[PDB]
Amino acid sequence: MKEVVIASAVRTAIGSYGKSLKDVPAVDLGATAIKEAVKKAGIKPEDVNEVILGNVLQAGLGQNPARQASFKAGLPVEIPAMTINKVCGSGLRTVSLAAQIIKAGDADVIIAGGMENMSRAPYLANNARWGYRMGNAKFVDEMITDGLWDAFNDYHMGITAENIAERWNISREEQDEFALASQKKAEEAIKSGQFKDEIVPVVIKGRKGETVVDTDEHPRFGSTIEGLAKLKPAFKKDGTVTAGNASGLNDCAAVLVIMSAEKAKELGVKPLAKIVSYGSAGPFYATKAAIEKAGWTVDELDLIESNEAFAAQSLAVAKDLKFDMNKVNVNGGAIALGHPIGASGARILVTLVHAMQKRDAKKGLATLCIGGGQGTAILLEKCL
Amino acid sequence: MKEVVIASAVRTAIGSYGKSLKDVPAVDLGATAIKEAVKKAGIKPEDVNEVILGNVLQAGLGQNPARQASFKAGLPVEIPAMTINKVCGSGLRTVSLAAQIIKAGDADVIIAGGMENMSRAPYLANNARWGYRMGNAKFVDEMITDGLWDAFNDYHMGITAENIAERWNISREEQDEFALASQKKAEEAIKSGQFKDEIVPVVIKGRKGETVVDTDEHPRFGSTIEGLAKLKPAFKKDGTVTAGNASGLNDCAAVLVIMSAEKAKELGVKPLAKIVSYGSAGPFYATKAAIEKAGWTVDELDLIESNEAFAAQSLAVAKDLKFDMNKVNVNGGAIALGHPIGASGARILVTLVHAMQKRDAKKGLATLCIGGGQGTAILLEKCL
Amino acid sequence: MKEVVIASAVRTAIGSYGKSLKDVPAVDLGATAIKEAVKKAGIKPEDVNEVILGNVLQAGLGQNPARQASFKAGLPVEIPAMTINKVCGSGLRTVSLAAQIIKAGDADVIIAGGMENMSRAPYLANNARWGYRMGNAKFVDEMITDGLWDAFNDYHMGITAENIAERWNISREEQDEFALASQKKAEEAIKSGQFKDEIVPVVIKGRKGETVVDTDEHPRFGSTIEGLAKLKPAFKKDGTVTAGNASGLNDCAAVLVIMSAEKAKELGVKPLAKIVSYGSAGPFYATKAAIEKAGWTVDELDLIESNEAFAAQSLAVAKDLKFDMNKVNVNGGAIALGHPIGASGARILVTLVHAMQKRDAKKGLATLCIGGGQGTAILLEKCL
Amino acid sequence: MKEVVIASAVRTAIGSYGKSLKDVPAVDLGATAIKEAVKKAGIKPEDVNEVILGNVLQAGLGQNPARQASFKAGLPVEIPAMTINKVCGSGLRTVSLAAQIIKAGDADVIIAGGMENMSRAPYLANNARWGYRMGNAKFVDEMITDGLWDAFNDYHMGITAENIAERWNISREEQDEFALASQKKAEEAIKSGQFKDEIVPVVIKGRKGETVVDTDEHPRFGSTIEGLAKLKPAFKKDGTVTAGNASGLNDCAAVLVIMSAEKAKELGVKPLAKIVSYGSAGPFYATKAAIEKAGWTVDELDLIESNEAFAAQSLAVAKDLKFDMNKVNVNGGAIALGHPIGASGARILVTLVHAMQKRDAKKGLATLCIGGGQGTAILLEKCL
Known part of the structure; x- marks a missing residue:
């Protein structure tokens, strides 16, 4: 059984809901992270055998968002790519899947990880195709339905x-x-x-300027226990869970280069860790x-x-x-x-x-x- | 390493667009095929290690459509499941993924295949969340965008x-x-x-009546060369491709039980073929x-x-x-x-x-x- | 002051919801009835001073539906037109408004009446412009909200x-x-x-064929008391009101030429009745x-x-x-x-x-x- | 022929698109102006015979927006009300209509004027009722379609x-x-x-505070000819019309109390002008x-x-x-x-x-x- 290692590990900053990454599609976040992950591993795009990426809110993102990210990163068009949805598990499961494929003898170098832009999730009209007939209906928040709601x-x-x-x-x-x-x-x-090594900057080119996003936006600096204690419950009357003791809705891509130990040796790569x-x-x-x-x-x-x-x-x-x-x-x-x-x-x-x-x-x-x-x-x- | 076999292979009938399966969510088609594949293989639902299903038009289907299919089929809630999107390749790639996982030594029995209900795909409002500001916009056909359009x-x-x-x-x-x-x-x-062994009926409960769908409805029986020659090009002026020489938009689930040869022997399974x-x-x-x-x-x-x-x-x-x-x-x-x-x-x-x-x-x-x-x-x- | 007469009175057939007139915009129904009312009155389109038409479901119909009906009818572009919404009263209130204008000395000849195509009413996204932010919302039935719901x-x-x-x-x-x-x-x-004098046919050009709609389609011929007694209450549990003892959702235009008695004499018109x-x-x-x-x-x-x-x-x-x-x-x-x-x-x-x-x-x-x-x-x- | 006068004339400030009045429905702007117009005329709500108000973007505003404004202003429920749509002409045409009704002998006191909230106009799905069938469609900006587009x-x-x-x-x-x-x-x-007499304040009560809007927002103080000369054309390549030499998209209500001279004398009202x-x-x-x-x-x-x-x-x-x-x-x-x-x-x-x-x-x-x-x-x- 082949040993499997992490050659490189890169992520964009994590943006806040409707804020710094609102204008940057998940696939572009993914492309930015892939391109840098390849560069950091010290390999070429041609050395990648397969692309496996988590993405949960795929609605309207177009065919095969992982393949889009791969292409936009400069990876050869012929490298196969697939998009994985295991909700919360997606991004880590791609890494173990990569390891499994490598263990099975079928690849040496795999781009794995995940991408999400919750800020850009659509709304849906589920009965628009064949018609609503009559009466008000739900204009469905797809982020909640596909990402946050217990089915x-x-x-x-x-x-x-x-x-x-x-x-x-x-x-x-x-x-x-x-x-x-x-x-x-x-x-x-x-x-x-502590995050400077792992974060790749995202460059947002306007019609009129460029903005660089390279810092995690979501933290609330100077938080206090009194500030948290005042918060209202988020989910139910008299609940314990608030916006302050739960995570947010956020945008990011995170990608790793996963390789057999043998290939890493062959390519001169110094691996970060073994899985x-x-x-x-x-x-x-x-x-x-x-x-x-x-x-x-x-x-x-x-x-x-x-x-x-x-x-x-x-x-x-x-x-x-x-x-x-x-x-x-x-x-x-x-x-x-x-x-x-x-x-x-x-x-x-x-x-x-x-x-x-x-x-x-x-x-x-x-x-x-x-x-x-x-x-x-x-x-x-x-x-x- | 391990030999990999197909224990069972089952599908629903394939429905035509907006017709016989219009009222049956992809996950319910998937659940029907899963339940019957497991029976046909002669194993217990608890012998299943993982579920891997292709599904392309995931929009608004809710968290982890593969997981929903699994649970609706009566598989144990603790079986992990993931939904794969590779567009055209999705359903077959789940079978090779299963073989890869088995070959890596991490599973003996995996439910693979895919599911789709194109009739039920939503329309999308991509800029409903933060607003359109002004001007007409696209009311997006999610089936075309996610499934049929070259990105x-x-x-x-x-x-x-x-x-x-x-x-x-x-x-x-x-x-x-x-x-x-x-x-x-x-x-x-x-x-x-010829399809009677492989088709599992789908039962649809109407308001009065259950309806059984067990026959592929898309074929145009009695087709003739003259009928086909009269059709107009569907994609470009003076084209060759028509409705008649292209496939349709269709709804189906197809599921296979994939196992190691050694586990099949152990469980008394008679497999149908080796991968x-x-x-x-x-x-x-x-x-x-x-x-x-x-x-x-x-x-x-x-x-x-x-x-x-x-x-x-x-x-x-x-x-x-x-x-x-x-x-x-x-x-x-x-x-x-x-x-x-x-x-x-x-x-x-x-x-x-x-x-x-x-x-x-x-x-x-x-x-x-x-x-x-x-x-x-x-x-x-x-x-x- | 002036006596006010009805010179002519014409209507389209009344279509049922989603049926015979589903493809004919309210303004086209209005135009058809206007053109024929003018002919029946035996006046020229240029003898018309103003157009006043009721229309309730104006959403997305474009600027000034009454004006569009007027222009589509072949009335001179310089005739002023206005669309009146009084919900249930709209069509009749235009007739008294006409009489009031004539009585005030400001017109001799006015086209009055109303038009509606309930089959074609849109759905609405009320917060699409500046955004929904988060959470499911209502996909609004504009027909119910604007026409049938007590505000x-x-x-x-x-x-x-x-x-x-x-x-x-x-x-x-x-x-x-x-x-x-x-x-x-x-x-x-x-x-x-009994309706042959008052109904103007509507001509619908299909892809092959014109279709003529000239008969009221909503009546349920052969109705019986037993058929009506079997129906379930439509609005409240153990109610009295049903589909059978209430009207439908329907599409029609009805137009009258309203004139001063003195102008009718002058133009050789034989009026039908005095208001x-x-x-x-x-x-x-x-x-x-x-x-x-x-x-x-x-x-x-x-x-x-x-x-x-x-x-x-x-x-x-x-x-x-x-x-x-x-x-x-x-x-x-x-x-x-x-x-x-x-x-x-x-x-x-x-x-x-x-x-x-x-x-x-x-x-x-x-x-x-x-x-x-x-x-x-x-x-x-x-x-x- | 009765003389007709203006007893009072009041308006809200004019808000800018998506700004100070974005959260205030047209009918509420209308109600605020009506209530004040009645107070300024020195009459009671009971003295008003009819309400006639212009409103162009009626989509989803509910039944009879003029009647809603009347009710919300405190006017007796039994006072008839109608909503007029003549696009650009709406608000002034209600005043002349009021004069006509008074001249005809049918009322003594009429609330006239208009109301609009362009910031709150919906988007529309025109084919949601009976279905789109397949393919992208228009998500229609209703403000443009019903208010700004030449039909x-x-x-x-x-x-x-x-x-x-x-x-x-x-x-x-x-x-x-x-x-x-x-x-x-x-x-x-x-x-x-110069506007202090005519503007009635709009009070926006939040969950947490109150905001008072009493000043016209749209003017660009310190405008210069150089600033205007730099602007890009709004409507066509090499056009002369820009955002700077055309009006905006704006929110306001403006209401007048229109009375016969005779009634004004009877009620002790000192009229502002005669029509x-x-x-x-x-x-x-x-x-x-x-x-x-x-x-x-x-x-x-x-x-x-x-x-x-x-x-x-x-x-x-x-x-x-x-x-x-x-x-x-x-x-x-x-x-x-x-x-x-x-x-x-x-x-x-x-x-x-x-x-x-x-x-x-x-x-x-x-x-x-x-x-x-x-x-x-x-x-x-x-x-x-």
């Missing part, structure tokens, strides 16, 4: 988080303290340059199973990226798995940084791997999504 | 078919004769029961290379399913690879039967494997899509 | 009819018997040619006051057109004013014939004046709409 | 203005100088309080005809409001009629102040009448719209 229970993902808060008995105060810590860690990380194990192979058993498959334990881990869609979910996973919180989300998490759904799993992988390199941490975990069959996790070991 | 050339797929017809001198008459033979072959296949090679591993080099990797030649093949999106494109492939037309699309092709894009690759593989069983044909090829990076192909060898 | 009570017009039925004890059986008689009377009127009084000059005091202003009583009337939007409302008016039902809606009413809102008041006046001519009835009343400020009524006296 | 020539009203510029040979420079003079006069008028004549009764013959009907001449006039939809149109009318430009639009015109189409005619009447009172000008003209059968004009004589 079975018929409520917002925010309601699942409220149920997890109740079930694990996680208070409003515990959630807001967790949020404030994410905010603080993100602020110092940004100000201390030791992944969830494909309590209710957080994907994460537990990936750790076990690595032959590791939670105590052994040096750094952990555990996504913060909701503070209540992050805290439940952390209590159940007994994470040392000093090693969790060291540069801030999704409450501060944002949750661009299709790209989010890849984004935290990009952040983990750069953090491992900067901090000399040997063992890393990236985990996100919760609930049976949705959890996605990868274990990384730093290349010496 | 780089900014024209319809139909133009590509015209381009191929032009470049190869595939005349209107030749395309019409090909279309007629496809029509005649579908009619005889349907009337002789010998696949495209991921002239301008139709994907298919050529797939054929070579199996150790075969085109002459050695017993049956061939080569998708008919457009007669022009099918005739171009057959000419280039020198197919014996007597072995091609023996039960009719997509011009007669329909082209439900996400499901189509899976649909032709379902029709191939049953036709191999019935006709005692040892070596089979399924191929669809044209152009570098897009060709998808699978070679099958029938099990003793 | 103060925020319920359907149908609820008002239920309210009246409730308050007056107008039972389901009584409403159904009224509906049946309306059906029977329309059927006999249509079959006996004696009008509503603008119990809770049906508009009609009562109109009757009194003519110097008349209800008993003195020879024929009455009282609009049937809902049987409940028609029975309430007839009870209160003590109409002799043998003189009411002698050729059938709106339950059978349809209720094209903008045109309806004009339509019933057209049917009244021809019925007076045919039946030699001297004194006529046209009345529609209910509730203070909304009642519209006109009294006619036939010319010798 | 016959199939181009923007801006193109008519370009044609008038060419026809009368009115240069870009002449147009921009006219615009700059409008801008300057508007700026001094605002700053010198001497009106266009209902070269290509600017409505204006010429109204002047003649008054028994006046252009030289006799003391003040003139001639609307400035486009500088090119304003200049053509002024050259043809030989206006003394020192008496034209003395407080600025529509280029500076805005063109809220349904209300615009009434707005300039409101401005004329207050200006006549402040400047002691005896004879006034209000004129707007151009082209056969569209021109609307009124002549006023100040009450001593």
Whole structure:
């Protein structure tokens, strides 16, 4: 079984809803990240065998958004590309799929990751083709429907988080303290340059000027516990979940170059980390199973990226798995940084791997999504 | 490494645009085919490790259409699922992905295939979220944009078919004769029961009555060469491509149970065929290379399913690879039967494997899509 | 001051929702009726001083639908035109407005009436211009909102009819018997040619063929009391109002040439009737006051057109004013014939004046709409 | 023939497109103006006989927008109301219609004028009811279609203005100088309080605060000829018409209390002016005809409001009629102040009448719209 490594890991800044990246289609974010990921790996476009990218809000983006990103990045037209939708899991699942294809003997170099522009999601008229006949109907927000709405229970993902808060008995105060810590860690990380290596600038050329976007926009610098304590609940009357202890709606692309170890050696590439194990192979058993498959334990881990869609979910996973919180989300998490759904799993992988390199941490975990069959996790070991 | 087999192969009937399946969401078609594939394979739903389904027109379908199909089929909620979009290749690429995952050692049993309901595609308002400001705008046909429109050339797929017809001198008459033979072959296949093993009925509950859909409705029985010659070009003035020599807009799901040979033995499954090679591993080099990797030649093949999106494109492939037309699309092709894009690759593989069983044909090829990076192909060898 | 006469009165057939006139814009219906009214009056288009037409569902019809009808009819471009919206009263109020303008000394000849195509009403996105921001919204049925929905009570017009039925004890059986008689009377009127003088054919050019629409299509011939008793309440649980005892959604134009008596003499016109009084000059005091202003009583009337939007409302008016039902809606009413809102008041006046001519009835009343400020009524006296 | 007078004249500020009045429905603007007009006339709500209001963009505003405004202003529910659409002519035509009804003997007190909120106009889906079937379609800007688009020539009203510029040979420079003079006069008028009497404040109550809008927003203070000379043409390549020498898209209501002289005497009302004549009764013959009907001449006039939809149109009318430009639009015109189409005619009447009172000008003209059968004009004589 071939060893599989991460050659490069790059992301755009994470934009806020309707703000810095509103005018930049997901496929263009993806192209910008691909082009740079190839350059950082020290390979040529011709060396890439396949492109596999997460994207959740595909509506109206045109045929095969991953292929569009590939093309717009300068990759040969003949490189096959596919777009993967596993909602929250999309961006990380492309990385493990890449590893699987490499293990199967069918490729040596794969561009993986994800892209999302939630700011640009359409509205839909579902019955426009054959007609509404009579009566008011729903003008459907496609971002909510395709990205945020529980298709079975018929409520917002925010309601699942409220149920997890109740079930694990996680208070409003515990959630807001967790949020404030994410905010603080993100602020110092940004100000201390921890994201400078991993972020590729996005250049927006107007008719009249150019704007460069290279900094994560979503963090609220100078956050306070009092500010958080005043917030109104987002999802239900008397809820614990607010806009302040949950992530946002955000825009980003995050891409990694995944290679066999053998090809990386052949191409002179110095790999960042090796992919030791992944969830494909309590209710957080994907994460537990990936750790076990690595032959590791939670105590052994040096750094952990555990996504913060909701503070209540992050805290439940952390209590159940007994994470040392000093090693969790060291540069801030999704409450501060944002949750661009299709790209989010890849984004935290990009952040983990750069953090491992900067901090000399040997063992890393990236985990996100919760609930049976949705959890996605990868274990990384730093290349010496 | 591991040998990979097809345990079962099932599809719904293919509906015509706005007709028999207009009221059945893609996910429900998918669920129907999944449930029956699992039964036909003689395994339990809990023996399934992962679900991978193609679906192109995902807009407004809700989170993770593959997951919804899985759950609606009665598969355990904790089985992971992902939705794949590769446009034309989606349904067949899920089968090779399954084989790759099994080969990597990460699964024994995977549900693969695809689903599409083109009749139900929405219209889109792309700038409803932050506003149109002023001026008329496009009310977007999501089916055309996401499924049928070339994102780089900014024209319809139909133009590509015209381009191929032009470049190869595939005349209107030749395309019409090909279309007629496809029509005649579908009619005889349907009337002789050739699809009865592979079709799972769909049950539609009306207000009073259940309706059963179990027959492919797109074929135009009694078609004639004179009828086809009267039609007007559909895509360009003085063109060759018409409604009559092109496939339709169609609704279907097609699902296969893919397993390791070793797990099939263990579970007492009698498999239908072995997957010998696949495209991921002239301008139709994907298919050529797939054929070579199996150790075969085109002459050695017993049956061939080569998708008919457009007669022009099918005739171009057959000419280039020198197919014996007597072995091609023996039960009719997509011009007669329909082209439900996400499901189509899976649909032709379902029709191939049953036709191999019935006709005692040892070596089979399924191929669809044209152009570098897009060709998808699978070679099958029938099990003793 | 001046006496005011009706020179001519013409209407299109009334189409059913989504049927015979679905392809004919309101303005084209209006143009057809205008052109023929002018011919029937025996005047020249240039003798016309002003055009005043009712139209309720104006959305997306383009600038000044009345003006478009005028111009499409071949009236001189310099004739001023205006579109009036009073919902239910629109078509009849244009006739009294015409009389008022003539009485003020500012015109001799005015085209009045109304037009509506309910089948063609749009759907609306009210927040498309500056954006929805987030969340599902309403895709608005403009026909219901602009035409059928009570803007103060925020319920359907149908609820008002239920309210009246409730308050007056107008039972389901009584409403159904009224509906049946309306059906029977329309059927006999249509079959006996009673509408042949007043209907102008509409010519629809299909791709191959012109189609002629010249017959009211909404009546349900062969209706029976048992058929009506089986229907379910349409507006509220255990209601009295049904599809069967209420009017439909309909398409029509109805136009009258209104002139001073002195100009009619001058131009050699033989007028059909004199306008004696009008509503603008119990809770049906508009009609009562109109009757009194003519110097008349209800008993003195020879024929009455009282609009049937809902049987409940028609029975309430007839009870209160003590109409002799043998003189009411002698050729059938709106339950059978349809209720094209903008045109309806004009339509019933057209049917009244021809019925007076045919039946030699001297004194006529046209009345529609209910509730203070909304009642519209006109009294006619036939010319010798 | 009764004499007819203006008891009161009130308007909201004129808001800019998407700005100060974006959140205030036309009917609420109308209600605010009605309520104040009644108060300023020194009458009670009960003294009003009828409500007649211009409104062009009625789409989705609900049943009978004029009646909604009446109700929301506190006028008795039983007062009849109608909504008039003559596009550009709407707001002034309601005033002459009011005069006609009063002359005919049918009312003593009428609320007239107009209301428009162009910022709130919907987008439309015209084929949503019965379906689009397949293919992209138009998402229709209803403001452009119903308010600004020539229904016959199939181009923007801006193109008519370009044609008038060419026809009368009115240069870009002449147009921009006219615009700059409008801008300057508007700026001094605002700053010198000339609009303080006529403007009623609009109070926008948020969830969290109140905002008061009482000043016209559209003027560009400090305009310069160089600034205007740089502007790009708005409507065609190499055009003379720009955003700087044409009016905007704007929001306003303007209402007047119109009474017989006899009723005004009876109620103790001191009238502002008498309505001497009106266009209902070269290509600017409505204006010429109204002047003649008054028994006046252009030289006799003391003040003139001639609307400035486009500088090119304003200049053509002024050259043809030989206006003394020192008496034209003395407080600025529509280029500076805005063109809220349904209300615009009434707005300039409101401005004329207050200006006549402040400047002691005896004879006034209000004129707007151009082209056969569209021109609307009124002549006023100040009450001593």
